[PDB]
Design a protein around this ligand. Structure first.
Ligand SMILES: CCCCCCCCCCCCC/C=C/[C@H](O)[C@H](N)CO
Ligand SMILES: CCCCCCCCCCCCC/C=C/[C@H](O)[C@H](N)CO
Lengths: 242, 297, 58, 246, 242, 99, 58, 49, 49, 48
């Protein structure tokens, strides 16, 4: 027969190897594929779809879980009080873990590109207000006050006919890619911190609520890519199914 | 006139699905054009209305002065084929010498991809999926030892005679596929075509498979689409005298030529049953980790 | 008539280049794939699109 | 020309609105009749057109300050309503897309935001005995509520283990009281089959759920109702038989 | 030698794999194939051949087995009485199990296409009669009366010079294919029910029988195909041959 | 009575739509129906029994004697084919031994 | 003279496309087959065919 | 019968001999017998730098 | 199948053999190689220093 | 619920005060005599 040598690697079963194997059904033909609306071709198509960013984190008491989807914003009787703040890291815990981008990122070790976080104001039409929203790139601590917060990438948001402003947090990294930043030595790949300040005030007329809520939606920009396939950070099983 | 006008013009029977959007090639990540300052009235990208139901169209070039970036990051890793061509655990078949479980060296397993969360959740991201498959069968003892045994895996499609014995007459396999492997041999591997009567498998069937009244009896058949119930899987010893070794068979599924369709939110609760999205009601967990205050990290 | 055409992705827009040894094409490799995307299908399925520069609600 | 002022005329029905968001076209794909290459049944289907393709007002829930949100399962909502449901009963096979116009309006001194969403194959799960050790299943009145719809057990989990935290994937539209007062979703026939039973199978589910709670001072209107309206598009029926129901 | 790696699947024996293997007889030549009448090339050629549909089911008493091949039809002294009824499902038990199509279907898990059931009247030439024959598609119960039976696909049959009418039960399914409908959850793939009513009456002159018999033949239409190979639903051996 | 099957087509029994049928008939061919390896023989070589006790068994080649492979084949009266025989050897427990 | 022609189906109407490594062609694969049918051979072997529309016995 | 599994940064690390992470639904793993010759795998350059 | 004979040398692991082996990561693309000053191409370049 | 089954229009209060319900000519005859009030209900137009 034809002379062959077996190189190391034979009889091994690599779970990700793309080889061929014997077919069970000779001349079987799959039932014709009719048209089905909204076909997915690349996971990046889903990563550009905005989903709720759970910036409010309170498990209390597993009944008020729906509060996790929104900001409390109220008529501060001061100047430039801090509203909210969270990490820009998508694969890190935990606000991004409510987003579809966050979970899809959980299936990939490396990502790259700008991200978008859109904030929708859900107060009354009579309610107005201007607020600063700052993105502070890696390095630097939590901005203690608004004056030393604006020094980074920020956007001034005016409440009006258009509910939502979108803070684009541009791809600012030393590396071409960022591995998940969690949570010690791997802070090297952190994206930074997003903080929300009151630019002026939440101002209300006589017959309208003194407190309103803000909803944050998050997704990836179009220069977004993912590179390395890992298992989901959390496995959902304890202990045997059925 | 002749014929009536409301039939002539009428768009009844229009076949082609009117496409609101076409697909463009994206081999690399999108490049970034240079940007400058802009102080104008009327041109306002940042302001948007989420109520509409669309994602932010605001590009980074109009939110910050940007440089030029020739992005050549590939998007190949993020495709349905290169995301699902990963062999995962989908079944564990036990053949103990004597126990509560199957004690005669013949086990039957109605083919259910679920029952193993990791492979399940990844797949449950989409509602409809159409794909060919590559099955791998790993056989060993409960200690992982390799022993000189001869197994017979047999694929039993819906309606075919199921084995009721270790030495059943159904093991003649005159038509339905079966594989004869030794445990000495490397894992058996088989390619499998898409064989649903529908254009795609469904991970979700929002309905009942039968007609009539749906009382509390036939209420467990809710969510049962037989289109992705592809039959049962059977193993032999082989006969005729009982085996000498305890055996374990693990089934691994690799997907190729994948085509998913409509996207689905991603499970955040512990899976509890096969083909059934039940969950522990008093132990409802948040989708992610939580912190002490919204003003702290 | 060449070989069998029983791959699951047969007759689709996607252009695959795959390796195969058996007569049935569904036993072929996952192979190299064509990179095409359509984000607007899910990210912007609105009827009357407005420009980036435009105020959506007016 | 404007974006928020819209009018929807189908058959002998007509919906007007002055404070809306743009119309969502589902998956960027307009509803269409079934081709001769997708179909498999040899029967010549009935396409009743105007009589069944029209708006139906089927329910009106009262959005209270502390509500978990509701859902409806399509097309079980119309099965007993109009001459659409008549065709859906006498026939075995059915095909249609819908034009859902959820509507809810308040003052300018009210606040709150609804989330209208169309989730295909919305399979519903049960609280597994509270502990997780019971493979119970939902009753008929929960999986196929029909006209009045069903109130969510828990809204965070979508009664299926899936999170509402990422429901805006499938075609959605917010009803934020300070900007819009109605949502409109146009879906095509979303199924792996060219036709289905319409009684047994439910193509999708409408999820009307508030995320930012309704709130108002001691004004002169505390009764704020959400009203559901829908309209079958490109309806086809095949496999004629006797009248059969649930 | 030429470097090779052994992928998983070696040494396995797949019973349906179409590979090659060594020949026992070098240069052996098969005796020339003379002409033999009526060659079969495709099993669909046999599936279009009509065979007896055993609608009458009575094992009593293994001697009156030949009665299983025919209907009893008689001079009903009423209106629209039910004559007979059976399932249209070919792979299901049990009337179709007498047909060649039924057994050949037993070697395939999936089928698709219209079916034809031809009814031959075997009364006297003096005997006349009109009868309705209804096909009720999936969903809906057994038609309680004739009035609520005709609402489906039906044919009015007049007894005359031509003995037989053929009820074509068209391919009416949601799926492109039907798996065998047997007998619980798999009712999803049911084809429906065929019922036989008296449209008018079985009318006879003075010197001819008050009771006659009808023979039903069944086969597949030309749009018929089969897709997946299974073992025969029943194995005919207990316990060892010879 | 004629002896022929019903020539009546569904297009003339019910108003029908257009259907571009592309369902393949390949699965229903004699090659793809019979290229399925089935059990046709079991040869026993026990150490000591009523059966062959000297490690030499003779089997006059008879396809029948195993119903499943038989009935499938018995559908036709005359058949002409090449064959692919496979021989599986093991102990009555299924054990693999160095013989 | 190419290779041996000792396949069982040699000289038939059917057009096979098969794979083989040995000199004897009967050791080849079942291979891909040509799809031709003739139902009338068994389903309608009558002498004088009448039309579908016609009354058979007249 | 061993199982080697590559666990990229952030992926769930096995905390048991029979951990749930051994399902390997995405991250590469290799199944070898000691009877078989040494398993061999080609690896690409996967640094972010 | 295609007739083959195994020559002596199979199953051996030669540490300096330049053969191929299976890839763990389908369609993985290395991060683009930017410019780094002073690249070495041959050890003789260093031996003249 | 059993009213909408006919010709109807959904009216939203806003900047434009008025909606107009067009009640289309739906009759069996080409013309309608006055429908008042017994046997002449044959020529009724309907109810709004
Ligand atoms: C030699 C044995 C080969 C076995 C072939 C089996 C292939 C089956 C393909 C997978 C079909 C989809 C799996 C089923 C879906 C889910 O498990 C449940 N049905 C969800 O309801
Ligand atoms: C290396 C051993 C190879 C053995 C070769 C045997 C090939 C025999 C081909 C099958 C011949 C037809 C089988 C006989 C038919 C039935 O069993 C009975 N004769 C029925 O009367």
């Amino acid at each position: 027969g034809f002379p062959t040598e077996l190189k190391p690697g034979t009889n091994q079963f690599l779970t990700t190897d793309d080889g061929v194997s014997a077919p069970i059904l000779p001349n079987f033909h799959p039932t014709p594929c009719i048209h089905i609306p909204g076909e997915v071709r690349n996971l990046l198509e889903l990563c550009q779809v905005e989903t709720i960013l759970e910036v409010n984190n309170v498990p209390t008491n597993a009944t008020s879980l729906m509060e996790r989807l929104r900001f409390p914003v109220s008529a501060q009787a001061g100047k430039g009080e801090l509203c909210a703040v969270f990490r820009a890291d998508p694969g890190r815990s935990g606000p991004w873990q409510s987003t579809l981008l966050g979970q899809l990122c959980g299936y990939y070790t490396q990502w790259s590109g700008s991200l978008e976080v859109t904030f929708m104001f859900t107060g009354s039409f009579m309610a107005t207000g201007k607020m600063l929203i700052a993105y502070t790139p890696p390095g630097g601590p939590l901005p203690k006050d608004r004056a030393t917060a604006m020094l980074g990438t920020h956007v001034i948001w005016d409440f009006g006919l258009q509910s939502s402003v979108t803070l684009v947090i541009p791809w600012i990294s030393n590396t071409h890619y960022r591995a998940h930043a969690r949570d010690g030595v791997f802070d090297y790949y952190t994206t930074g911190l997003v903080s929300i300040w009151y630019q002026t005030n939440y101002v209300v007329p006589i017959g309208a609520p003194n407190t309103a809520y803000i909803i944050a939606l998050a997704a990836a920009q179009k220069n977004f890519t993912m590179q390395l396939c890992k298992d989901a950070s959390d496995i959902l099983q304890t202990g045997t199914i059925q | 006139g002749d014929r009536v006008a409301d039939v002539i013009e009428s768009s009844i029977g229009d076949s082609v699905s009117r496409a609101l959007t076409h697909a463009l090639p994206a081999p690399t990540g999108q490049n970034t054009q240079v940007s400058s300052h802009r102080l104008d009235t009327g041109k306002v990208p940042a302001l948007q209305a989420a109520e509409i139901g669309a994602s932010s169209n605001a590009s980074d070039e109009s939110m910050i002065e940007t440089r030029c970036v020739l992005n050549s990051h590939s998007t190949a890793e993020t495709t349905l084929d290169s995301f699902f061509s990963r062999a995962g655990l989908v079944g564990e078949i036990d053949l103990p010498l004597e126990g509560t479980t199957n004690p005669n060296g013949y086990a039957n397993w109605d083919i259910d991809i679920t029952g193993y969360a990791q492979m399940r959740r990844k797949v449950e991201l989409f509602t409809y999926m159409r794909f060919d498959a590559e099955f791998t069968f790993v056989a060993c003892t409960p200690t992982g030892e390799v022993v000189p045994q001869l197994l017979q895996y047999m694929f039993v499609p819906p309606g075919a005679p199921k084995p009721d014995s270790r030495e059943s007459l159904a093991w003649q396999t005159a038509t339905n596929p079966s594989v004869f492997v030794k445990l000495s041999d490397p894992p058996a591997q088989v390619s499998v075509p898409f064989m649903s009567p529908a254009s795609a498998y469904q991970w979700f069937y929002d309905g009942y498979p039968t007609f009539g009244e749906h009382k509390q009896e036939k209420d467990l058949e809710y969510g049962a689409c037989p289109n992705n119930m592809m039959g049962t899987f059977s193993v032999r010893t082989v006969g005729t005298s009982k085996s000498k070794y305890p055996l374990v068979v693990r089934i691994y599924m690799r997907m190729k030529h994948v085509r998913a369709w409509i996207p689905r939110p991603m499970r955040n609760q512990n899976y509890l049953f096969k083909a059934n999205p039940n969950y522990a009601g008093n132990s409802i967990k948040p989708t992610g980790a939580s912190r002490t205050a919204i003003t702290t990290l | 008539s060449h070989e069998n055409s029983n791959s699951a992705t047969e007759g689709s827009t996607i252009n695959y280049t795959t390796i195969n040894y058996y007569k049935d094409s569904y036993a072929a490799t996952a192979g190299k794939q064509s990179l095409k995307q359509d984000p607007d299908k899910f990210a912007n399925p609105v009827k009357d699109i407005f420009t980036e520069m435009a105020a959506p609600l007016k | 020309y404007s974006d928020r002022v819209a009018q929807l005329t189908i058959g002998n029905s007509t919906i007007t609105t002055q404070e809306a968001a743009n119309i969502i076209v589902g998956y960027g794909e307009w509803p269409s009749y079934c081709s001769d290459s997708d179909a498999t049944a040899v029967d010549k289907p009935t396409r009743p057109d105007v009589s069944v393709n029209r708006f139906y007002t089927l329910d009106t829930k009262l959005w209270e300050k502390s509500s978990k949100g509701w859902y409806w399962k399509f097309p079980d909502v119309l099965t007993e309503t109009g001459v659409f449901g008549q065709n859906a009963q006498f026939h075995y096979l059915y095909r249609s897309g819908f034009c859902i116009h959820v509507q809810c309006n308040a003052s300018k001194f009210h606040q709150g935001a609804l989330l209208v969403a169309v989730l295909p194959e919305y399979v519903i799960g049960t609280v597994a005995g509270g502990t997780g050790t019971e493979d119970s299943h939902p009753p008929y009145k929960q999986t196929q509520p029909g006209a009045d719809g069903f109130e969510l057990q828990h809204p965070y989990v979508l009664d299926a283990g899936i999170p509402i935290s990422q429901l805006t994937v499938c075609p959605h539209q917010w009803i934020n009281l300070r900007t819009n007062n109605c949502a409109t979703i146009i879906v095509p026939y979303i199924n792996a089959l060219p036709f289905d039973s319409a009684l047994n199978h439910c193509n999708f589910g409408l999820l009307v759920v508030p995320i930012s709670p309704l709130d108002y001072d001691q004004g002169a209107t505390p009764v704020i109702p959400i009203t559901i309206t829908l309209a079958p598009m490109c309806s086809e029926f095949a496999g004629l038989r006797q009248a059969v129901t649930q």
